[PDB]
Symmetry: D2
Subunit: 115 residues, 4 copies
Amino acid sequence: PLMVKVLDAVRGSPAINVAVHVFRKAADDTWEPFASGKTSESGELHGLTTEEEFVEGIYKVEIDTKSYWKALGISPFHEHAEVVFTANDSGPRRYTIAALLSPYSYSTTAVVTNP
Amino acid sequence: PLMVKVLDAVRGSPAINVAVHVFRKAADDTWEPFASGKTSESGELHGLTTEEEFVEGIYKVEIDTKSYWKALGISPFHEHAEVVFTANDSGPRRYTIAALLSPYSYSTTAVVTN
Amino acid sequence: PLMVKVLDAVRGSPAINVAVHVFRKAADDTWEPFASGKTSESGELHGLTTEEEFVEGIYKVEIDTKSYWKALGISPFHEHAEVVFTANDSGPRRYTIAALLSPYSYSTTAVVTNP
Amino acid sequence: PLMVKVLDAVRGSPAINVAVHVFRKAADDTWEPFASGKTSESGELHGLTTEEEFVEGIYKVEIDTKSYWKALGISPFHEHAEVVFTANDSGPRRYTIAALLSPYSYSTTAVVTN
Ligand SMILES: O=C(Nc1cc(Br)c(O)c(Br)c1)c1ccccc1
Ligand SMILES: O=C(Nc1cc(Br)c(O)c(Br)c1)c1ccccc1
């Protein structure tokens, strides 16, 4: 129920091998690690979680943009891109978090569907 | 009543000395030259027109993004960026057309205020 | 070799039933109609052209954003979103033109791959 | 040396009276409050800090987008927008953090100049 897609606005390509870490806010207000992975050759990261495990909560999707750009030999501006949202509060939904990256800018959008 | 602002998402800077052409749609559906200039050191192009001249109608703002990228030694995707909109007297009176450029992407927004 | 995808930033959804018209610059510098179609329920428009037909040239992809928003009962700013680019000039490539729409703003990106 | 500008892509306007909090990363990796304010009628928040106070380091700019949308009667997706970056004295001296808001999307860019 959660997929992350990342594109590169400089190359006109998927952003491959981007590390993504997902956190969930705990009862004590700290960010607990929830799932992590890397984008594939298509710029997509599938299989982060399951419908059982992806319960209601406040989630943070951290896209490690600095690590991506530095691995390409570029010095970018941001440390990462964070996307923070409440999920599943009216029941289970499927979420796609999409991001488009440039060295000094990024855009993110969500596509939320009811299966 | 019309200002154009252009930013560069690669370098994190204004996009300086970018050519911008404005056209007005004529009765026969052709695009007639209306105003033009180059962005300043702040990425902004002021003074394109006046209230008297900027009547309701369809306008197109063409931003020469290809020359901009090539002067920086970068191969870009688009021939230019285009922004086509209707000026409407029932809305606010000042229009800022902003664009944010990357080699393979651009975004544009309108900020319309009184 | 040419696909168009459109998303809606207000709804967090694919932009369904968006009309798209593609033009190709002719020898006399006019825009000749090349292909057209509508986005599906996924926000994707497939099947615009063929590798035989999609020769080198300067193409314009016009995404009819005003018609989309008006069909939803909203008064938007732009008439359409245009994407103008040279295609296939180093041989055949596959192009995805993606757009993200809001009533007063849009973003577009290209993903260009070599098959 | 730091200004924050917020725009609304739905209404085509500055995003006015949006709360913005700036934090500096402390030695123990916690986020310490640094400066805050609300955007003006132009969507801009000036005067957050001074050159003396704005030393190199990692900063986070948190924009309260959820309250902004709810005050307009619109249900938004994000809890807030975050922008996390390093201030570097080897680059230009003035930073503008700009954000463009939609209910289910946002974009941000840095404009860094001397
Ligand atoms: O989210 C965007 N693109 C995008 C999103 C998804 Br989902 C997708 O499968 C593909 Br192909 C492209 C986008 C972001 C900014 C500007 C234009 C598109
Ligand atoms: O329209 C944008 N930025 C912008 C727009 C204006 Br008018 C301005 O004075 C500054 Br400084 C920045 C924008 C576009 C994409 C992502 C973030 C901001």
